[PDB]
Amino acid sequence: SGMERIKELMEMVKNSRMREILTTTSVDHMAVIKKYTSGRQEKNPALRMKWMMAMKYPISASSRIREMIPEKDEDGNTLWTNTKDAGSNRVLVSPNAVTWWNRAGPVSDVVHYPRVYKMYFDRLERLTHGTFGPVKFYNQVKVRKRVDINPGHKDLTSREAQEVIMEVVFPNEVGARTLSSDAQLTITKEKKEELKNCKISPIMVAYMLERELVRRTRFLPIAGATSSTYVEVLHLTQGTCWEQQYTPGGEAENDDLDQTLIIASRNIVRRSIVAIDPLASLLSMCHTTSISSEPLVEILRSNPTDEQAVNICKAALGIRINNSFSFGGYNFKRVKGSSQRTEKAVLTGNLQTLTMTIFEGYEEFNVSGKRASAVLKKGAQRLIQAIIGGRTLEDILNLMITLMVFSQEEKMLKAVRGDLNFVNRANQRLNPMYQLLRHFQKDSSTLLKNWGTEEIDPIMGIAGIMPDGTINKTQTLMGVRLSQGGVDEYSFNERIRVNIDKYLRVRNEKGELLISPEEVSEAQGQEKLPINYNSSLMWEVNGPESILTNTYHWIIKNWELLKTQWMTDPTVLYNRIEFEPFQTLIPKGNRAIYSGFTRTLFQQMRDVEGTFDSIQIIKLLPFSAHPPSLGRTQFSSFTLNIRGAPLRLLIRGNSQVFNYNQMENVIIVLGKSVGSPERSILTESSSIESAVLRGFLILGKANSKYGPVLTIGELDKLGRGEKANVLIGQGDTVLVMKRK
């Protein structure tokens, strides 16, 4: 009852050396005297275990084992010996004592292993009831992402989970730390209800709760699903050349299923716009698609996720639409106005360069979620008016902060104080809007102080908020009015029946344009649950690099027939549907002029005889799949969008995208080999290059007989028969001739 340890301490305080240590060493210096050693330490414990098992007693244990294990076996082996000098509480133990305990020890009916190691038993239950699909062989494209090896509690972060663990196991040992969330209080109550009168040691209970509640993340090379139940068996599902289909035992998490639903719908829409019939391609792609071995067309019937790509799939199916999106924990029911997105470069308040997508255009919103409501008028980079209401004082200010971040002006972007990285520690592009949102939600003073004040007319229906917080009805912020009732609910849960057409634009039954395919985000995130587009319109694994490598692999392995289509009747070759997911990586403005440039190069390669290069047909053939323009320009590269970053594909020679190694005689696409064309390249590779310049033939290297060098776009002052030199690229100097 606590009287034995105080007599232990009174016995240890009469020894003067022990008393000097107890009186002079503080609690912070007891961390130092705990790891104090004096004797020799031993390196290489592997070799020491290799030789110490040859001894009779390689195991040391507590002295109690003299009363729980006999000295001899049935077979006569000695199970333990005491150590030589007495007084120590240790004896030397043979492994035959271990085997004797496992064959004739006392049997206890209670075992704490299935409770403490519940996580490993849940993995085993997930594996035992897991279904295995076939194994497919193709080029994997793995991305090193930060994934969860431990999913943790959904309501807790790792710091809050450690707070909960120190409150459940060691309640008198939290310092000046209180629990913040209602989630932390409820989980502390539940875990104190389970772990009461527990016979397990508190440290083992702490590590059990630590492997239950604490989220752990590692950087792993992931192809496909990054949920914590698909990362636990990551060694089994993916390899360097193969993909093993697998579905665990249980239900998919809803917060994972909504996210991979959004990603599946975004991929289906963005593939559908490129097609001839976007509606028929979307309906063909949506039925065969299965997320985590559950069909997509029956997840869309019951999922309440509302997003501009999920909504186009639902409007094509016949599901009622909640025409909205989500931003910062609030649903944004857009009422009036239609904006359109444009990529710009914005200098920030921390002198940081940043590239975003800002929406040019007029809009009107009805923002509302879970504690508050606001009506918002907003143009391109302007926050006009915000009649914000709610149910407390803090919540209307929180919605005000969220709407001021959502405005995307030139004023909040130059109002940042401190640091705000838009790349991670591995230089991976963090989302800039949520970065500015989580910045201006903790430190929000310098946004309000730079927001200023405005004089408003003191008429009812509108109050005002100052840039500190004292409510006045004469002076307000520059747009921030306080609604005295808010906005009416019960019409934001109301879903709307909608029309859709061939080109995937959603109308209501009135006729107001709700969603266009241009509003769909061209962000390439990867899913938590595996998506299987079981279609002839999508490759096996999606993503930009997989589309690139699969397209070039399909061109290479079908080159004997595609070459024959290229030689005679090429207008059916460019319009093949296998080139169609490639166009989703070209930005929409360049597709027609890239296809016109490529078709002009291919026609010059047909007309100028003997100038055949099959690598130059393979490299540029997926760019010719768009109805072209007529704009006579000169490209030195074709830029594609991969993971939010551009990548240039050079017209002449090899690059980081498309290389052809004469060592292995293999075409390498993005670090992955996609094969040899037909090993039929020796009949090709003459001197004169034809498919590099639009209207000009490359005749060897440069010459001093033919004037000074140029650059690429200096050829309009040339005539049929004028030969010149061009600094084409990659430090090359070539001679250039004009055709008739």
Binding site: W51, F132, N139, L236, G239, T240, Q244, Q662, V674, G675
Partner: protein, 482 residues
């Protein structure tokens, strides 16, 4: 520093510095670089802890004696199947060593094997065995304070190793090591049930790999080295004072499925009171052999060879009678070398990974498992050798055995010369690769690169063979551009 304003300082000291401070890129072309300079001198000597291509085993088929598994019982059962024991006579003297000591060591060994009553055998501390194990060859370590008045107290000498020459036997050892046998030397353990489809695919490929890798001779050297280092470690740590006898015993299964116990010789352990991890336990190795040492005598510099028997050897036309020699030497090892010798089985992991990647890099391009087409459609894909005609291409099993034997010899002949040579020639391999990629390579000091590579080729037969291999690969690359 707080009020420093840059006024173009770096460009000023770039103008002020000499133009003899530069990094001039010299262009790299392998059709113009010279080969590695192998040293000159006496030929290289065998330095392994057991005979590899020359060892002879007394074998018993399906042992069923009183000690079927005990070491000296299997040694006695294998020695009982040899009745040609004549008197020991030295036929190849160790030059630096008393050869009558090696003769008397084999006599004492065989006689105590005869009167052996027990499971272990500790030899008697005789004068010739004390010479052959070096008992007393250390000076007595004193404290300096107690020997400040010594006139002849000079130092330990730190000569480098003497430059030896590439002898032809190490290529023959690597040739015999990469060959199949009529036995199975690795006897693997069990797995679980192959439930997943990838476990069926992996088990099919692993059965191919096991068929090609368990019957290689390098697997026999794996089992010999693992057994010798295991027994030597246990005896060094449990029998420190006693001169324990350890028989070289391996256990194999023939391709007809019958077990066999092979005896290759004996190892008399020395005194082993090792405290460091580089402290050397001395031992004496006595291995049976049929090869006459007088034909390739430069290989056997540290060996005393005494002819000890006769045996009727069968041949392809008729049957003859041959003598039986016993290669005796003093050798030594350490706890680190015994540790890394007990773990030679991971050489299987070093080769079989690489070959599997060679399948997998094809399997991602062919969109199918290319394990069975690699092991059955014998199209002779990888170049692994050099004949007097041209360059010889083998199959994936031959490549698997060659890479196995290369990892095995990396573990047998481990030295700092090998580490330095591989690290410094990796750069030259990468420069040759960058040239073959048409990636226009170039160095700043190729003479210093060659000087750093050739600094490690001193006296090791494996490193000299690897430098010769590098020269042959460079000549093959130069011939590939003709």
């Amino acid at each position: 520093v707080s009020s420093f304003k840059a006024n173009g300082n770096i460009e000023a000291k770039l103008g002020a510095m000499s133009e003899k401070v530069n990094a001039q890129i010299e262009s790299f072309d392998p059709r113009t670089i010279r080969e590695l300079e192998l040293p000159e001198g006496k030929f290289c000597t065998q330095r392994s802890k057991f005979l590899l291509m020359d060892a002879m085993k007394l074998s018993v088929l399906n042992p069923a004696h009183e000690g079927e598994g005990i070491p000296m019982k299997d040694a006695k059962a294998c020695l009982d199947t040899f009745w040609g024991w004549k008197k020991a006579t030295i036929i190849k003297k160790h030059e630096k060593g008393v050869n009558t000591n090696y003769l008397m060591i084999w006599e004492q060994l065989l006689e105590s094997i005869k009167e052996m009553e027990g499971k272990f055998l500790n030899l008697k501390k005789t004068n010739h065995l004390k010479w052959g194990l070096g008992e007393g060859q250390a000076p007595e370590k004193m404290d300096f304070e107690d020997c400040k008045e010594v006139p002849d107290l000079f130092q330990y000498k730190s000569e480098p190793p003497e430059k030896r020459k590439l002898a032809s036997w190490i290529q023959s050892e690597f040739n015999k090591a990469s060959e199949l046998t009529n036995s199975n030397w690795i006897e693997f353990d069990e797995l679980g049930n192959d439930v997943a489809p990838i476990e069926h695919i992996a088990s099919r490929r692993r059965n191919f790999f096991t068929a090609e890798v368990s019957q290689c001779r390098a697997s026999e050297y794996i089992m010999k080295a693992v057994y010798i280092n295991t027994a030597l470690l246990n005896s060094s740590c449990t029998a420190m004072e006693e001169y324990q006898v350890i028989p070289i015993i391996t256990k194999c299964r023939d391709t007809s499925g019958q077990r066999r116990t092979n005896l290759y010789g004996f190892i008399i352990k020395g005194r082993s009171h090792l405290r460091n991890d580089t402290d050397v336990v001395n031992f004496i190795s006595l291995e049976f052999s049929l090869t006459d040492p007088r034909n390739e005598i430069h290989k056997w510099e540290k060996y005393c060879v005494l002819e000890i028997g006769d045996m009727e050897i069968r041949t392809s036309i008729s049957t003859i009678m041959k003598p039986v020699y016993l290669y005796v030497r003093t050798n030594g090892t350490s706890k680190i070398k015994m540790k890394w010798g007990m773990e030679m089985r991971r050489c299987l992991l070093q080769s079989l990974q690489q070959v599997e990647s060679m399948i997998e890099a094809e399997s991602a391009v062919k969109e199918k498992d290319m394990t069975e087409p690699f092991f059955r459609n014998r199209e002779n894909d990888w170049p692994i050798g050099e004949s007097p005609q041209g360059i010889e291409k083998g199959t994936i099993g031959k490549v698997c055995r060659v890479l196995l034997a290369k990892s095995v010899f990396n573990s047998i002949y481990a030295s700092a010369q090998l580490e330095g040579f591989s690290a410094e020639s990796r750069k030259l391999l990468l420069l040759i690769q960058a040239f073959r990629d048409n990636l226009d390579p170039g160095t700043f000091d190729l003479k210093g690169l060659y000087e750093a590579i050739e600094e490690c080729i001193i006296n090791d037969p494996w490193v000299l063979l690897n430098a010769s291999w590098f020269n042959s690969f460079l000549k093959a690359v130069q011939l590939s551009m003709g």
